[PDB]
Amino acid sequence: MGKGTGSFGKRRNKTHTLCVRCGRRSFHLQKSTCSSCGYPAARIRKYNWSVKAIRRKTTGTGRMRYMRHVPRRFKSNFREGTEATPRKRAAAAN
Amino acid sequence: MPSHKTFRIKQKLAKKQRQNRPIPYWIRMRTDNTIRYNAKRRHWRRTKLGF
Amino acid sequence: MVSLKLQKRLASSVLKCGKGKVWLDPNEVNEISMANSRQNIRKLVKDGFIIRK
RNA sequence: UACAGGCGAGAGACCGAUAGCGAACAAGUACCGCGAGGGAAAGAUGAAAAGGACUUUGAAAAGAGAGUCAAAGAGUGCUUG
RNA sequence: AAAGAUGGUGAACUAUGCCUGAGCGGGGCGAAGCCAGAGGAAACUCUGGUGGAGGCUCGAAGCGAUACUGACGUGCAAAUCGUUCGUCUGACUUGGGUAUAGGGGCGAAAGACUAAUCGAACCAUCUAGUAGCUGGUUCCCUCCGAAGUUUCCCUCAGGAU
RNA sequence: GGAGGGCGCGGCGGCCGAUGCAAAACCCGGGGCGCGAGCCCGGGCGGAGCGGCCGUCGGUGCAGAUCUUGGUGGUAGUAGCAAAUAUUCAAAUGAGAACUUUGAAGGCCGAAGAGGAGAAAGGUUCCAUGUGAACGGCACUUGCACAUGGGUAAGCCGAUCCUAAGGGAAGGGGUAACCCCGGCAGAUAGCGCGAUCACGCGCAUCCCCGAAAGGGAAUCGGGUUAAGAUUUCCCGAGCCGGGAUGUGGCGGUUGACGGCGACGUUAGGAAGUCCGGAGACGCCGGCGGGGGCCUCGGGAAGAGUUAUCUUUUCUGCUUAACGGCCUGCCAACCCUGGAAACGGUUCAGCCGGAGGUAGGGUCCAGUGGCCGGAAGAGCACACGUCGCGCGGUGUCCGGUGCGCCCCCGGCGGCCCAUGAAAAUCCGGAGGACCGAGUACCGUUCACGCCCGGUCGUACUCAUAACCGCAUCAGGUCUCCAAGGUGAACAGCCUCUGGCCAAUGGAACAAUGUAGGCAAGGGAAGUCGGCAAAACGGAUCCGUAACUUCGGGAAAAGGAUUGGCU
RNA sequence: ACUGGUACGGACAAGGGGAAUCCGACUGUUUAAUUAAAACAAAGCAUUGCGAUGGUCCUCGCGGAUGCUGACGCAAUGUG
RNA sequence: UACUAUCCAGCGAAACCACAGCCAAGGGAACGGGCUUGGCGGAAUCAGCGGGGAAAGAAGACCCUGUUGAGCUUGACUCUA
RNA sequence: CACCAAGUGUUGGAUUGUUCACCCACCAAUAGGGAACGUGAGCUGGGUUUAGACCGUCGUGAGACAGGUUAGUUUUACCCU
RNA sequence: GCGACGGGGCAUUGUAAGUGGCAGAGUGGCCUUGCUGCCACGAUCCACUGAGAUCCAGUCCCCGCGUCGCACGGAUUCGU
RNA sequence: CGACUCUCGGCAACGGAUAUCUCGGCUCUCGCAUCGAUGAAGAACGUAGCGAAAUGCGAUACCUGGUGUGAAUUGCAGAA
């Protein structure tokens, strides 16, 4: 028989499967490409016509960012100070 | 055959099963106050889990 | 309620036959229910309380 | 000279929970779709939990007394209603 | 609005092809060939049989759906169910793997179908697109108070005057 | 439609007031003012900030928009909850039982199952225990619900390994680029083998993924828990691959003989290289043999009928992977022999005239036998509680075929269709090189020693664990397939396995829906024979104008059909 | 051969038949969820071009289809 | 004859609704439940029913128009692989 | 032929979707008109009038046809009267 | 006063179970070899047997048989 | 004649509007430069005594060294 009922009922084929890179069912199996980030692909799939909702997903929120932030903040890469040792030091100022 | 064996899917099933657990009573006090009525507990008969 | 759902299997799975072949005594209902594991079921089968119709 | 991102700040005849951002709250969360993508609902007891011991009815849930509170005509359906 | 553009996403439905697997009860019909006998000197021709062939027929599983324009028609169901029935050893049925994607595919060709979507799929964007046309257009009182006419117009559902 | 003069709200600069001794807000068939826009005041509710006036400014006033978003009616306690053959009785439990659970009973699916399992899919749903707030459109103490716990163990099964259709890095070249063809100066750019010694020798279309279905290194049995068990566990027995070796044997004719040969066997060198064959093949038809299932007699045990009759009826009666010894006909081959009155023989004319029929051998070893496995197991009994388990037996021997299913064999039909490849891999040819004796050579042999990594395993598999919002009458790949009647794997009835849950009760009206039947007539009905209805299976007889001579044809049309002896 | 039933495939199962005309030759195929047909296919018939460093097609270049084929072929946007 | 309807116990929607609901004729957006004039004028209701509510579902698919599209064709305009 | 008179009858088939038409045949008679061209939540769906399709004509073509021909989904009342 | 069965009437259908039989197409098997041979088997037929079975529910009757028949109290409403 | 039909009030239930709140949004302005094969952006799955989540972290796992502050953390337990 025809449309809708018979379209649903078969479904024993698979196309979009889990992607490793982005964790989204979007990996087109029989053409070996992800349509959500590109899985084999030199560059990550970025579109600047795909607007508000989608862009923010790829911006992420499971991000690190804080670890990266601390080098921006100091700008140097050293510091040195080992005060607070029995003597009573220099570990209580003013 | 197995019942899709691949590890990437398999780990997600394990994670989601663990995730689909009720909120534990005590924490509602140690949040201050705000109704912690989880949300990420899903049931298999309704909806569908995407990978 | 008395749960003899568990009693229907185990008895089936040691008499090598269906669950419409296993017969449970209708007076001994509570003690049969009390047996909860397959080793205990074997004791009942031996003594003829559970018997294959 | 630029600056709707990022980080760290100062403000506005800004908005006041159907408003303001999609999201004041676990929100790009829950959920929807095969996918590309789409995407919510949801703030307020009170000064302090002092979140109703105990007695009684009822299978229990609850109720009735009582206790507590400045107020239960404030009992996690909670300010006003 | 119908659309139009741009960039993406689908062959898990279905269309077809390839590769590799599975499945098709029991008949009707009685092909080539083979055999005996017969008649014939020959050339040859009869007859009874054997044998089991076919995009062959009846008809289960399967696959399909002709009619009731039945049931149902706010359903069991965004296409089902009953009876009746088409096909059922091949241009057969069907799975998995695999190929082909949007002015493109595929098509034993119906503009059919391509995941409830097809005379150009769906999605986001350009886009807050445009529409002389339909709808609606938000507190009061006062005073004055029209016109559907002239002229031009791809203009006669509208403007200028 | 214009202009005019006002009112109300939010916020801002000014100015003045009001408040927990009760602000704002909200309520009020309570009063009063203004033409109105609105305003004022009281009472009730309430509990923390607010209003008036003068300027300023807006995201500034609603009844609509097939309006948007939230709430709530009438409808309506109304349509309904009607397919799937079906429930009922007693007991248990509990507060409460048509539905739970147990028995009894009635049934149903009717082995192409409503069955036992796997795929795919879901993901813990499986099971225990707790248990009725929500949910199972009735109910409910029950649940595939909710809460709390546990559970999937592999050298031998799969994945893995391997290739296919095909996909895709690498090269060159377009394309800024994404991206796409796809390899190139891996070709006197290096991968592979000896080789330990540093050196020599040899070679491509590479190299991976690609069927958890193709192809394939290697396991069986019993027991067990909540469950699939070759799979978990365990006994006992293997089998494969890798590594070590020692013992025996193999070889002084140096690299085994015997046998007419076909070929036989516990060893019986073998570098580079070569060549073959194995992996390895369509589909249909009939036939052969096997296994299991079916049929059936005797015989050893338990069960039933058992007014009555029946030496009747039912049921257990089993034997593995793996190995020994022995064994298969077709196909094929060896030897004898010399055939006319030519033979055997296929579904196609094929054996024999390049030697048959016939006689004697040989081979492929599916399979059976008996023995090993292995009863130490398992099954059926008796007895015992001597119990989480005690002691004993018996478990045997025949028969039958168009039966059923599957396999395996060798044939035959088909084609303008002639029906894969690789890992895996042995063989022969090749003979270099190395062969010794008190040892060296075989080390494809037997026996002995050790080791075997990675990942999946729960369970459902559907009228309720999948997909359709969903416990949806739908759909969804495969394996097993009893007995009768009968061609039947048709229908119907039943076994075995599985349900008894299809909300239940009462009346059982008209009217519907679904199913039947009607005297006499017989399509007059109607657009139309739409379907109801009839014919129907088979055996025999009979069979048309016509025709591409194959058919029509089961033409038409008749007759026949039992029980039993 | 006896004998019973209105009677005998008694259930279940299981073609109504014939004659003409129109039309497609046939079996086959499709409008999936209103149309299975006389439509689509088709054998057969007719019919194409390119002798190849060429035809016809893709890809913008390369390479690729046809073509592991190559005029009794392949293709003709698959003609009629 | 079954299964419904009906009646019960439980359970329980939706479509739809300006406000509602007795006729006749008249005029009237030229076919009234309502206005006008006559006739009338059961509370409270159930099972039925198919006349009506120009009942409901669907911005009539037709038809016309819009300086609105799109599919197609070509001896349109204009370009082009 | 004319009158009072709708009290009561006014037909079956063949064919055509046709009412109409035209026959056959009966008969006392086989009058004529209306009611949203009475009558689709009453039906049927045959005509008209979609999407498939064939033929002829017209048209370069796509298509068209007051020309023929075939096959083509008939939803909901339980509310109010 | 009233009720279920039964009995009898009324109906329906068509002659049961059991028993007997040179009834019976026939056939076996043991002898004592049967002018009644016996034992079975045997569709079926007949007698007993117009029998058996059913018959008020929407048939009729009874003075057979026993109870309900609670001398209702169980449940409820009404005033000019 | 209750009732019904209708209406209102008072008290409620319904509902979450209104008022008053706001560790938030929103928009403007200012300062600042500072990712990566030295393994990123982003993901996955684990780790807290008792955690589902968010947040934090990575087998050195709601954290470590060092340093500042100078006694808490808290739902309960707990170390002393």
PDB file of N, CA, C and O (backbone and C1' of nucleotides) in Angstrom, chain A residues 63 65-77 79, chain D residues 5-8, chain K residues 31-36:
ATOM      1  N   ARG A  63      32.501  23.995  26.960  1.00  0.00           N
ATOM      2  CA  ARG A  63      33.792  24.604  26.781  1.00  0.00           C
ATOM      3  C   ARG A  63      34.677  24.616  27.995  1.00  0.00           C
ATOM      4  O   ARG A  63      34.211  24.522  29.130  1.00  0.00           O
ATOM      5  N   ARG A  65      37.814  27.229  28.267  1.00  0.00           N
ATOM      6  CA  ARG A  65      37.854  28.668  28.132  1.00  0.00           C
ATOM      7  C   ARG A  65      38.550  29.358  29.279  1.00  0.00           C
ATOM      8  O   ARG A  65      39.335  30.273  29.050  1.00  0.00           O
ATOM      9  N   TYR A  66      38.291  28.932  30.540  1.00  0.00           N
ATOM     10  CA  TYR A  66      38.863  29.491  31.746  1.00  0.00           C
ATOM     11  C   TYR A  66      40.347  29.230  31.795  1.00  0.00           C
ATOM     12  O   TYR A  66      41.118  30.094  32.207  1.00  0.00           O
ATOM     13  N   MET A  67      40.768  28.018  31.374  1.00  0.00           N
ATOM     14  CA  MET A  67      42.143  27.579  31.377  1.00  0.00           C
ATOM     15  C   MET A  67      42.971  28.430  30.447  1.00  0.00           C
ATOM     16  O   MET A  67      44.073  28.856  30.787  1.00  0.00           O
ATOM     17  N   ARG A  68      42.397  28.717  29.258  1.00  0.00           N
ATOM     18  CA  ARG A  68      42.912  29.600  28.240  1.00  0.00           C
ATOM     19  C   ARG A  68      42.990  31.039  28.697  1.00  0.00           C
ATOM     20  O   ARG A  68      43.914  31.761  28.324  1.00  0.00           O
ATOM     21  N   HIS A  69      41.991  31.488  29.495  1.00  0.00           N
ATOM     22  CA  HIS A  69      41.821  32.849  29.956  1.00  0.00           C
ATOM     23  C   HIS A  69      42.949  33.351  30.815  1.00  0.00           C
ATOM     24  O   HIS A  69      43.311  34.519  30.705  1.00  0.00           O
ATOM     25  N   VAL A  70      43.512  32.508  31.715  1.00  0.00           N
ATOM     26  CA  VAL A  70      44.491  32.954  32.688  1.00  0.00           C
ATOM     27  C   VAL A  70      45.765  33.480  32.034  1.00  0.00           C
ATOM     28  O   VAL A  70      46.215  34.535  32.470  1.00  0.00           O
ATOM     29  N   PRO A  71      46.367  32.893  30.991  1.00  0.00           N
ATOM     30  CA  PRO A  71      47.472  33.507  30.265  1.00  0.00           C
ATOM     31  C   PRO A  71      47.206  34.856  29.649  1.00  0.00           C
ATOM     32  O   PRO A  71      48.144  35.648  29.584  1.00  0.00           O
ATOM     33  N   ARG A  72      45.962  35.134  29.184  1.00  0.00           N
ATOM     34  CA  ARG A  72      45.557  36.435  28.693  1.00  0.00           C
ATOM     35  C   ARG A  72      45.647  37.475  29.777  1.00  0.00           C
ATOM     36  O   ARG A  72      46.055  38.607  29.530  1.00  0.00           O
ATOM     37  N   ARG A  73      45.220  37.091  31.002  1.00  0.00           N
ATOM     38  CA  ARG A  73      45.120  37.962  32.142  1.00  0.00           C
ATOM     39  C   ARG A  73      46.461  38.427  32.650  1.00  0.00           C
ATOM     40  O   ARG A  73      46.663  39.629  32.814  1.00  0.00           O
ATOM     41  N   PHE A  74      47.422  37.494  32.891  1.00  0.00           N
ATOM     42  CA  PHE A  74      48.726  37.862  33.404  1.00  0.00           C
ATOM     43  C   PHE A  74      49.608  38.518  32.372  1.00  0.00           C
ATOM     44  O   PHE A  74      50.212  39.547  32.668  1.00  0.00           O
ATOM     45  N   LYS A  75      49.684  37.934  31.146  1.00  0.00           N
ATOM     46  CA  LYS A  75      50.455  38.417  30.014  1.00  0.00           C
ATOM     47  C   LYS A  75      51.911  38.029  30.088  1.00  0.00           C
ATOM     48  O   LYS A  75      52.511  37.709  29.065  1.00  0.00           O
ATOM     49  N   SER A  76      52.511  38.039  31.306  1.00  0.00           N
ATOM     50  CA  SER A  76      53.822  37.509  31.632  1.00  0.00           C
ATOM     51  C   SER A  76      53.807  35.993  31.536  1.00  0.00           C
ATOM     52  O   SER A  76      53.127  35.427  30.681  1.00  0.00           O
ATOM     53  N   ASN A  77      54.570  35.292  32.405  1.00  0.00           N
ATOM     54  CA  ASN A  77      54.530  33.849  32.478  1.00  0.00           C
ATOM     55  C   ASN A  77      55.290  33.400  33.697  1.00  0.00           C
ATOM     56  O   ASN A  77      55.493  32.202  33.886  1.00  0.00           O
ATOM     57  N   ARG A  79      56.377  34.597  38.109  1.00  0.00           N
ATOM     58  CA  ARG A  79      56.002  35.086  39.415  1.00  0.00           C
ATOM     59  C   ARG A  79      56.733  34.145  40.326  1.00  0.00           C
ATOM     60  O   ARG A  79      57.195  33.083  39.905  1.00  0.00           O
TER      61      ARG A  79
ATOM     62  P     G D   5      28.788  41.769  21.364  1.00  0.00           P
ATOM     63  O5'   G D   5      29.780  40.730  20.705  1.00  0.00           O
ATOM     64  C5'   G D   5      29.317  39.427  20.328  1.00  0.00           C
ATOM     65  C4'   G D   5      30.517  38.488  20.168  1.00  0.00           C
ATOM     66  C3'   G D   5      31.309  38.235  21.442  1.00  0.00           C
ATOM     67  O3'   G D   5      30.614  37.290  22.261  1.00  0.00           O
ATOM     68  C1'   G D   5      32.805  38.666  19.714  1.00  0.00           C
ATOM     69  P     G D   6      30.692  37.480  23.829  1.00  0.00           P
ATOM     70  O5'   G D   6      32.239  37.328  24.095  1.00  0.00           O
ATOM     71  C5'   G D   6      32.822  36.024  24.027  1.00  0.00           C
ATOM     72  C4'   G D   6      34.307  36.125  24.346  1.00  0.00           C
ATOM     73  C3'   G D   6      34.600  36.780  25.692  1.00  0.00           C
ATOM     74  O3'   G D   6      34.376  35.811  26.718  1.00  0.00           O
ATOM     75  C1'   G D   6      36.017  37.709  24.077  1.00  0.00           C
ATOM     76  P     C D   7      33.568  36.200  28.022  1.00  0.00           P
ATOM     77  O5'   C D   7      34.619  37.077  28.802  1.00  0.00           O
ATOM     78  C5'   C D   7      35.730  36.370  29.369  1.00  0.00           C
ATOM     79  C4'   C D   7      36.815  37.373  29.729  1.00  0.00           C
ATOM     80  C3'   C D   7      36.469  38.497  30.688  1.00  0.00           C
ATOM     81  O3'   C D   7      36.444  37.966  32.019  1.00  0.00           O
ATOM     82  C1'   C D   7      37.695  39.383  28.893  1.00  0.00           C
ATOM     83  P     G D   8      35.281  38.393  32.999  1.00  0.00           P
ATOM     84  O5'   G D   8      35.783  39.765  33.592  1.00  0.00           O
ATOM     85  C5'   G D   8      37.125  39.925  34.065  1.00  0.00           C
ATOM     86  C4'   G D   8      37.448  41.412  34.186  1.00  0.00           C
ATOM     87  C3'   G D   8      36.318  42.315  34.715  1.00  0.00           C
ATOM     88  O3'   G D   8      36.184  42.201  36.135  1.00  0.00           O
ATOM     89  C1'   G D   8      37.273  43.320  32.875  1.00  0.00           C
TER      90        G D   8
ATOM     91  P     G K  31      38.592  54.127  26.082  1.00  0.00           P
ATOM     92  O5'   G K  31      39.150  52.974  27.010  1.00  0.00           O
ATOM     93  C5'   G K  31      39.970  53.359  28.127  1.00  0.00           C
ATOM     94  C4'   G K  31      40.303  52.125  28.959  1.00  0.00           C
ATOM     95  C3'   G K  31      41.086  51.036  28.231  1.00  0.00           C
ATOM     96  O3'   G K  31      42.470  51.384  28.157  1.00  0.00           O
ATOM     97  C1'   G K  31      39.350  50.040  29.386  1.00  0.00           C
ATOM     98  P     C K  32      43.299  50.942  26.885  1.00  0.00           P
ATOM     99  O5'   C K  32      43.406  49.383  27.080  1.00  0.00           O
ATOM    100  C5'   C K  32      44.181  48.831  28.148  1.00  0.00           C
ATOM    101  C4'   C K  32      43.854  47.343  28.291  1.00  0.00           C
ATOM    102  C3'   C K  32      44.193  46.550  27.040  1.00  0.00           C
ATOM    103  O3'   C K  32      45.611  46.388  27.021  1.00  0.00           O
ATOM    104  C1'   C K  32      42.072  45.902  27.822  1.00  0.00           C
ATOM    105  P     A K  33      46.420  46.398  25.666  1.00  0.00           P
ATOM    106  O5'   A K  33      46.347  44.901  25.189  1.00  0.00           O
ATOM    107  C5'   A K  33      46.945  43.915  26.037  1.00  0.00           C
ATOM    108  C4'   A K  33      46.671  42.521  25.496  1.00  0.00           C
ATOM    109  C3'   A K  33      47.256  42.216  24.109  1.00  0.00           C
ATOM    110  O3'   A K  33      47.646  40.852  24.058  1.00  0.00           O
ATOM    111  C1'   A K  33      44.924  42.062  24.020  1.00  0.00           C
ATOM    112  P     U K  34      49.101  40.461  24.477  1.00  0.00           P
ATOM    113  O5'   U K  34      48.760  39.138  25.224  1.00  0.00           O
ATOM    114  C5'   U K  34      48.918  37.827  24.715  1.00  0.00           C
ATOM    115  C4'   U K  34      47.628  36.995  24.615  1.00  0.00           C
ATOM    116  C3'   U K  34      46.894  37.079  23.287  1.00  0.00           C
ATOM    117  O3'   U K  34      46.393  35.773  22.971  1.00  0.00           O
ATOM    118  C1'   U K  34      45.444  37.820  24.936  1.00  0.00           C
ATOM    119  P     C K  35      47.178  34.833  21.983  1.00  0.00           P
ATOM    120  O5'   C K  35      46.306  33.520  22.013  1.00  0.00           O
ATOM    121  C5'   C K  35      45.891  32.919  23.247  1.00  0.00           C
ATOM    122  C4'   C K  35      45.323  31.526  22.952  1.00  0.00           C
ATOM    123  C3'   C K  35      46.251  30.574  22.187  1.00  0.00           C
ATOM    124  O3'   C K  35      47.200  29.977  23.077  1.00  0.00           O
ATOM    125  C1'   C K  35      44.186  30.598  21.116  1.00  0.00           C
ATOM    126  P     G K  36      48.595  29.502  22.479  1.00  0.00           P
ATOM    127  O5'   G K  36      48.275  28.276  21.536  1.00  0.00           O
ATOM    128  C5'   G K  36      47.830  27.051  22.138  1.00  0.00           C
ATOM    129  C4'   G K  36      47.446  26.054  21.047  1.00  0.00           C
ATOM    130  C3'   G K  36      48.549  25.764  20.015  1.00  0.00           C
ATOM    131  O3'   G K  36      49.546  24.908  20.573  1.00  0.00           O
ATOM    132  C1'   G K  36      46.556  26.116  18.889  1.00  0.00           C
TER     133        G K  36
END
